[PDB]
Amino acid sequence: SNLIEVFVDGQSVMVEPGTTVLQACEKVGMQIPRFCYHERLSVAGNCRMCLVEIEKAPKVVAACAMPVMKGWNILTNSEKSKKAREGVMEFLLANHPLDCPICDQGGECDLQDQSMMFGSDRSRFLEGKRAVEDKNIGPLVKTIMTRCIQCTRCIRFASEIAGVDDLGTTGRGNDMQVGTYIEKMFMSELSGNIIDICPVGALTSKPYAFTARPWETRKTESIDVMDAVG
Amino acid sequence: GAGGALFVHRDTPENNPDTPFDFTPENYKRIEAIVKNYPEGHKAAAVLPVLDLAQRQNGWLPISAMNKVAEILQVPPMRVYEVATFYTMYNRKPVGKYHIQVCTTTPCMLRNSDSILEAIQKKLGIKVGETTPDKLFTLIEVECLGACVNAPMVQINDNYYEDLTPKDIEEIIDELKAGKIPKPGPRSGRFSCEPAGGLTSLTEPPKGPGFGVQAGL
Amino acid sequence: FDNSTYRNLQHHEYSTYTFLDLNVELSKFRMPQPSSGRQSPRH
Amino acid sequence: APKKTSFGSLKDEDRIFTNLYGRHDWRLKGAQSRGDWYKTKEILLKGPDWILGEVKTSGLRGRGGAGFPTGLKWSFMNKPSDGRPKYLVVNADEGEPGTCKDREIIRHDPHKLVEGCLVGGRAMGARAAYIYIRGEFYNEASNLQVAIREAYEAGLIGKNACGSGYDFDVFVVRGAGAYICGEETALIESIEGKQGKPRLKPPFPADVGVFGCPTTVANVETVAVSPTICRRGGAWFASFGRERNSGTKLFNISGHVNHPCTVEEEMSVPLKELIEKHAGGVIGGWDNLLAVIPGGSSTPLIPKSVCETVLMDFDALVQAQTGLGTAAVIVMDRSTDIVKAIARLIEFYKHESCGQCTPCREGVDWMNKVMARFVKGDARPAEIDSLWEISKQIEGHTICALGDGAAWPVQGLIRHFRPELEERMQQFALQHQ
Ligand SMILES: NC(=O)C1=CN([C@@H]2O[C@H](COP(=O)(O)OP(=O)(O)OC[C@H]3O[C@@H](n4cnc5c(N)ncnc54)[C@H](O)[C@@H]3O)[C@@H](O)[C@H]2O)C=CC1
Ligand SMILES: Cc1cc2nc3c(=O)[nH]c(=O)nc-3n(C[C@H](O)[C@H](O)[C@H](O)COP(=O)(O)O)c2cc1C
Ligand code: SF4
Ligand code: SF4
Ligand code: SF4
Ligand code: FES
Numbered sequence: 003s004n005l006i007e008v009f010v011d012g013q014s015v016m017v018e019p020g021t022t023v024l025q026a027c028e029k030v031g032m033q034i035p036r037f038c039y040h041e042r043l044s045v046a047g048n049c050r051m052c053l054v055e056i057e058k059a060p061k062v063v064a065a066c067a068m069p070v071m072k073g074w075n076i077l078t079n080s081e082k083s084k085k086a087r088e089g090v091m092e093f094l095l096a097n098h099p100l101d102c103p104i105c106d107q108g109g110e111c112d113l114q115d116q117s118m119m120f121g122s123d124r125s126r127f128l129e130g131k132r133a134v135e136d137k138n139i140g141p142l143v144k145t146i147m148t149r150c151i152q153c154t155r156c157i158r159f160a161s162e163i164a165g166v167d168d169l170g171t172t173g174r175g176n177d178m179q180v181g182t183y184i185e186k187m188f189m190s191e192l193s194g195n196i197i198d199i200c201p202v203g204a205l206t207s208k209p210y211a212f213t214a215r216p217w218e219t220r221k222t223e224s225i226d227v228m229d230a231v232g
Numbered sequence: 233g234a235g236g237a238l239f240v241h242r243d244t245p246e247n248n249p250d251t252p253f254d255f256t257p258e259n260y261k262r263i264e265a266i267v268k269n270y271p272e273g274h275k276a277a278a279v280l281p282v283l284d285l286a287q288r289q290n291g292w293l294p295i296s297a298m299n300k301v302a303e304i305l306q307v308p309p310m311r312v313y314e315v316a317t318f319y320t321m322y323n324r325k326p327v328g329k330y331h332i333q334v335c336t337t338t339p340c341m342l343r344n345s346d347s348i349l350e351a352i353q354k355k356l357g358i359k360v361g362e363t364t365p366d367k368l369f370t371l372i373e374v375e376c377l378g379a380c381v382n383a384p385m386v387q388i389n390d391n392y393y394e395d396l397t398p399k400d401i402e403e404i405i406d407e408l409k410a411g412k413i414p415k416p417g418p419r420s421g422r423f424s425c426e427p428a429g430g431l432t433s434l435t436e437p438p439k440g441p442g443f444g445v446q447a448g449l
Numbered sequence: 450f451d452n453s454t455y456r457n458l459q460h461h462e463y464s465t466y467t468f469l470d471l472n473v474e475l476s477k478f479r480m481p482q483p484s485s486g487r488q489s490p491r492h
Numbered sequence: 493a494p495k496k497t498s499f500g501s502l503k504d505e506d507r508i509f510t511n512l513y514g515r516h517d518w519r520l521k522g523a524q525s526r527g528d529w530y531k532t533k534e535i536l537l538k539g540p541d542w543i544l545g546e547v548k549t550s551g552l553r554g555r556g557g558a559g560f561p562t563g564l565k566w567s568f569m570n571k572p573s574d575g576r577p578k579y580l581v582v583n584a585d586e587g588e589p590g591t592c593k594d595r596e597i598i599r600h601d602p603h604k605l606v607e608g609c610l611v612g613g614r615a616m617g618a619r620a621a622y623i624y625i626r627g628e629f630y631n632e633a634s635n636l637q638v639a640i641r642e643a644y645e646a647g648l649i650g651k652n653a654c655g656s657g658y659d660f661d662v663f664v665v666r667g668a669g670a671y672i673c674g675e676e677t678a679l680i681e682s683i684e685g686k687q688g689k690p691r692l693k694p695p696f697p698a699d700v701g702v703f704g705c706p707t708t709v710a711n712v713e714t715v716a717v718s719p720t721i722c723r724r725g726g727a728w729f730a731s732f733g734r735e736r737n738s739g740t741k742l743f744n745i746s747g748h749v750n751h752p753c754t755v756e757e758e759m760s761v762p763l764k765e766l767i768e769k770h771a772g773g774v775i776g777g778w779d780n781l782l783a784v785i786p787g788g789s790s791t792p793l794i795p796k797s798v799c800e801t802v803l804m805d806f807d808a809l810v811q812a813q814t815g816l817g818t819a820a821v822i823v824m825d826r827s828t829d830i831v832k833a834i835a836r837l838i839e840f841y842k843h844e845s846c847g848q849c850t851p852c853r854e855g856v857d858w859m860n861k862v863m864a865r866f867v868k869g870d871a872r873p874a875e876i877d878s879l880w881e882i883s884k885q886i887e888g889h890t891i892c893a894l895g896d897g898a899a900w901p902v903q904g905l906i907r908h909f910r911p912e913l914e915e916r917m918q919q920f921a922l923q924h925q
C-alpha cells in the first residue's frame with residue numbers, strides 16, 4: 003500500500019502520507035494537548051502546546067503541523083514533552099486573569115483542565131499582569147478579552163467557515179489584541195459557534211451568562227426543529 | 233517603556249469614515265505601477281506600498297485612507313487594519329512636519345545617545361512622545377536603525393544624521409525650523425562608514441575589469 | 450584617481466516620490482507577470 | 493605554503509567589496525570600471541549546474557547569520573518545473589542591532605547586488621528577484637532603483653538579460669519598520685501583503701515560498717559575493733579562513749572603540765587583531781576591555797579572558813559558546829553598566845516580537861520585566877536561576893528564532909556576570925533595609 007510505518011511510544015502504526023504527528027498519535031488513543039488546533043480549521047501552529055519529542059531528535063516539534071516521517075518514534079510522555087508542556091502552560095498562565103469564579107467557562111475550560119493534567123501546580127510569576135479593554139461584537143457573544151490566549155481560532159472560523167473577514171489581530175508582541183479594530187457587530191447566521199471554538203472564557207454566550215455551571219446541567223441529546231436541516 | 237498608543241479605533245470628527253481622503257491622479261498612476269509588480273491573482277501583495285503611498289500624500293493614515301486602500305485593492309478592510317497596526321512606520325495619528333526618531337538601542341546607548349535625546353528635549357521643550365504647539369516637530373525613540381557604526385544618530389523624514397553631538401543636533405534642529413534642509417550623513421568629517429581617521433583599508437586603487445578571472449571562462 | 454571625495458551625493462536631492470517615480474519608469478521594462486488563474490483567492 | 497595557521501591580513505586585491513567606503517562611482521560606469529558585469533553572459537551560458545558547483549566548492553556559508561552552506565541551500569531549488577513560477581528573494585531587512593554592512597553594500601555597490609541577483613536566479617532557475625529592503629533605508633532603496641534602471645537600459649537585466657536568452661526581473665520592495673520581517677518566512681509573508689509573522693517549517697521556501705511558489709531567501713552579502721566567486725574561481729574563495737570557515741567577511745565594529753567602522757577581513761581573523769588593527773583598539777586600552785558581543789545582539793557575550801585568543805569564524809565562536817551571527821562586534825569597556833546593556837537588548841527583543849506564538853510573546857516580556865528589576869537590584873538570588881529556567885523554556889520552543897535570540901544574551905549575562913547581579917541584589921537589599 004501507500005501507508006507508511008511510524009511508532010508511537012514504540013507501537014507500530016500504519017498511516018497515510020501527509021498524516022501529522024497529532025493524528026498518528028490519536029490513532030492509538032493518545033490525545034496530544036492543544037489550544038489552537040481545531041480539526042475543522044486550518045492549521046495555525048502558534049499555541050505551542052502540542053510540542054512533542056521525536057526519538058533521536060534534539061528539538062521538539064509541533065505535532066499539529068508536522069507530518070510523520072517513515073520510521074519516526076513519537077515519545078508522547080518523555081521528560082522533554084512534559085517539560086515543554088509545563089513551560090507552555092506557565093507562559094499561558096503568566097498573564098491570565100484570576101477570573102475562574104466569575105468566568106462562565108469555569109468547569110468547562112480547556113485551559114483549566116490542561117493546566118491540571120499537564121502543567122505545574124504553582125506559579126513563580128512575580129510581576130503585574132496585562133489587561134485588555136473589552137470589544138463589542140453584538141448582543142449574542144459576550145467579550146472579555148483579558149482571558150484571550152491568542153489562539154486565533156475565532157479569526158480562522160470567521161474567515162473560512164463563516165466567510166466573514168471582520169475578525170483579526172491588531173498590534174504585535176504582548177500587546178497584540180484580537181478584535182475588529184472598529185466598533186462593528188459580528189453578524190452571521192453561524193456567529194455563535196465562535197463561543198464553542200474559544201477554549202477560554204474570552205468569548206462567552208451573553209443570554210446564558212451567569213445562569214449555570216456545567217457540572218449542574220443534565221444533557222439531553224435531541225434534534226433541532228427551527229429549519230429542515232435537522 | 234510601553235507602547236502608549238492604542239490598537240483600537242474610536243470615531244472622531246478628525247478621523248472617521250466620512251473624513252475626506254482620495255488619491256491624486258499621479259498617485260493613481262503610481263498605484264497602477266505598484267500593482268503591476270506582482271503576479272496576477274495576488275493584489276494583496278500591494279497593500280504595503282500603496283498604504284505607504286497614502287501616508288506620503290496625507291502625512292498620516294486616517295481610517296478613511298485604510299478603507300480607500302482596501303477598496304482599491306479589493307481586500308477586506310480588516311486585513312488593511314492589521315497591516316497598518318502591525319508595522320511601526322505607519323502613522324495612525326497625525327505627527328509633526330519633521331518626525332524625529334532617535335535610536336536608543338545598546339550600540340547607540342553606548343555612544344551617549346541620552347545626551348542627544350536630552351539635547352533635543354531641552355531645545356524643543358517637549359517630551360519623548362509629544363508634538364510642538366506649532367506642529368513642526370515630533371520626537372520619539374526607536375530601535376536600531378541600521379547605522380550603529382555611525383552612532384549616535386537620528387532620522388528625520390527619510391534622512392540619516394549620524395555621528396551627532398548635542399551641538400550638531402541643536403544646529404540641525406534650528407536650521408530645519410528656519411525653512412532649510414540639512415544635508416544628511418555623519419557630522420564628524422567622516423561622511424561614510426570608514427574608520428574615524430586613516431582609512432586603514434582600500435587605500436590602493438581598485439583593480440581593473442577581469443583582473444582575477446579564472447581560466448576557461 | 451582620487452580618494453578624498455565622497456561620490457554618493459545624489460541622495461541629497463531625493464524627494465518623497467523618487468522611489469515610486471523610479472518604479473513607474475521601470476514599469477515599461479518588466480516582463481508580463483504570471484497568472485494564478487483567478488482574479489483573487491476569494492474568487 | 494599550504495595550510496595556513498594565521499589569518500587576518502589580506503590585501504586590497506582580494507577584497508570583494510572594493511567600494512565599501514563610497515569613494516568611487518556607485519553607478520553603472522564606475523562598477524564596470526571596477527570589474528562588475530564582466531563575462532556575465534558567459535557565466536550564464538555555463539549553466540545552473542556550473543554555478544551551483546562553483547558556489548559549493550567555494551565553501552561559502554550563509555552570511556545572514558545562520559551560516560548554512562550556500563551550495564546545498566541554492567541546490568534545493570534545482571527541481572524541475574511543476575507549473576509554478578520560481579522566485580529569488582534577497583533579504584535586505586538588516587534589523588540586527590550592531591549590523592551596518594548590507595546598508596553600505598546597497599548604497600555603495602548596488603550593481604554587485606543586481607549582478608548577484610541575476611546569477612543566483614539563473615542558478616536556481618528563478619524568473620525574477622524580489623529585493624526586500626528596510627523601510628527606513630529610503631535613500632539606499634532609491635539608489636538601488638537607480639542602479640536597476642541603469643541595468644535595464646544597458647540590457648543587463650530584463651528581457652534577454654545580457655544576451656543569454658534568459659529573462660530576469662529585479663523588483664525592490666520596501667517594508668515598514670519590523671525587525672521580525674528579516675526572518676525569511678516573515679519576510680515572505682510581508683511581501684504577500686500580510687503581517688510579518690513567520691511560517692512554520694516544513695514546508696521550506698524551496699517547496700512553498702512567496703505566493704506559494706518555490707523560493708530561496710538569501711542575504712545581501714551572500715548574493716553579492718556570488719558573481720565574484722563565479723569569476724575569480726570559487727576555489728580562490730576557499731583559500732581564505734579555516735576549513736568550513738572560508739572566504740572574506742564584512743565586520744561592523746561598534747561600541748567602545750576608538751574608531752568604530754565597517755571593514756572587510758579574512759574570515760578567521762582573531763578578534764583582538766580585528767579590534768586593534770581596524771577599530772583602533774578599545775577605549776582606554778585593551779586592558780580596559782570588559783565584554784564583547786561578537787555577532788550582534790542575538791549572540792551571547794564573552795568577557796575579556798575569552799577575547800584574548802578567540803577566532804572570528806563560525807566554529808571557533810561556537811566553541812566559545814557564542815556563535816558568529818552577523819559578525820557585528822559590539823565592544824563594552826569596564827566603565828559601562830553591562831546589566832543595563834543586556835536589559836536594553838531584552839527590551840529591544842520585547843518590542844520586536846511579532847506576538848504570534850506563546851513562548852516568545854509571553855516569555856520575552858516576562859524576561860524584560862525581570863531584567864528591568866535586575867538592573868535596579870530589586871530581586872533575589874534565586875530569581876537568577878528562575879530567569880535561567882525561563883530562558884531555557886523559551887529557547888527551542890518557539891516558531892522562529894527570535895525567541896532563541898532573546899534567550900541567548902540573558903544566558904550569556906548569567907553565565908559570565910552572575911557576581912555582578914548578586915552584588916547589585918545585596919546592595920539594593922542593604923540600601924533599602
Ligand atoms: N542579518 C540580521 O540583521 C540578523 C541575523 N540574524 C541571524 O539569523 C540566524 C537564525 O536564522 P534562521 O533562518 O532561523 O536559521 P536556520 O538554521 O533555521 O536556517 C537558515 C537558512 O538555512 C535554510 N535551511 C535550514 N535548514 C534547512 C533544511 N533542513 N532544509 C532546507 N533549508 C534549510 C533555511 O531555508 C534558511 O534559509 C541567526 O543565526 C541570527 O544570527 C538574526 C537577526 C538579525
Ligand atoms: C528574528 C530574525 C530576524 C532576522 N533578520 C534578518 C535580517 O534582518 N537580514 C537577514 O539577512 N537575515 C535575517 N534573519 C535570518 C534569515 O533567516 C536569513 O537572512 C535567511 O535565512 C537568509 O539566509 P542566508 O544568509 O544563508 O542566505 C533573521 C532571522 C531571525 C530569526
Ligand atoms: S478562561 Fe478558564 S482559566 Fe481563565 S478565568 Fe475563565 S475558567 Fe479560569
Ligand atoms: S477570542 Fe478565544 S478563540 Fe479568539 S483568539 Fe482569543 S482565545 Fe482564541
Ligand atoms: S518567536 Fe517571537 S517573533 Fe518568532 S514567531 Fe514566535 S512570537 Fe513571533
Ligand atoms: S496545537 Fe499545535 S501549536 Fe497549537
Ligand code: FES
Binds near residue numbers: 380
Ligand atoms: S543601535 Fe542605533 S542604529 Fe543600531
Ligand SMILES: [Mg+2]
Binds near residue numbers: 200
Ligand atoms: Mg468559550
